[PDB]
Each structure stands twice: as structure tokens, then as C-alpha cells.
Design a binder for these strands. Structure first.
Length: 49
DNA sequence: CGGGCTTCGGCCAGAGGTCGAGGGTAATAAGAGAATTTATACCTTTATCGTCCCATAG
């Protein structure tokens, strides 16, 4: 319902949901987990998992 | 030929080792302003309870 003159593209889009989704996936997903750094081989076998 | 009567098929419930150990992540937006109640603060009024003088019973 907003007008082209009444609203600007920067004021229409809310970027909060995409940032929240990216943060949630990168911090709380099952596949996101702390790297095994006790061995250099542990890192390689974790990233190739 | 309707009717008990057995049987079968679809649907839902419940239950799935224990004890560790470590790590991480956990949840937001109206202002105004009017109104009503409530905790506060000062003050007076009555009773209460600590307190002692006094007459007396032995």
C-alpha cells in the first residue's frame, strides 16, 4: 500500500530475519560444532566428515 | 434373507542400556495522561506496662 514516493527501498526491507537465520544456522545447527584441535589430523578428519 | 458372529484390516500408544566426560545455547518495544490506590510521613490520643511510694500483716 505504500507509495513509490512515500517509501524508499532502504526503508522497506528489514534485514533482521536473514541475519537471525544465518546466526542460528552458524551457531546452533547440529552440523555446526567446535573443531577438534587436539591433533592436526583431527582437524582434517573433522572437515572431511 | 436379515442377523448374530467371527475375523481381519486400518489406526494409535508405548517402549526401546548404563555410567561417565567435555563443549555450547538458551527469549523483546505506544505515548499521553487520567485516575485510583497505596505506601509514607507527621501528629495527636488512648492504653499499657515498667516503676516506685506507702500502709500493713506477721
Amino acid at each position: 500500500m505504500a507509495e513509490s514516493e512515500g517509501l524508499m527501498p532502504q526503508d522497506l526491507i528489514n534485514a533482521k530475519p536473514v541475519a537471525a537465520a544465518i546466526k542460528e544456522f552458524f551457531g546452533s545447527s547440529q552440523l555446526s560444532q567446535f573443531m577438534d584441535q587436539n591433533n592436526p589430523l583431527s582437524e582434517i578428519t573433522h572437515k572431511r566428515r
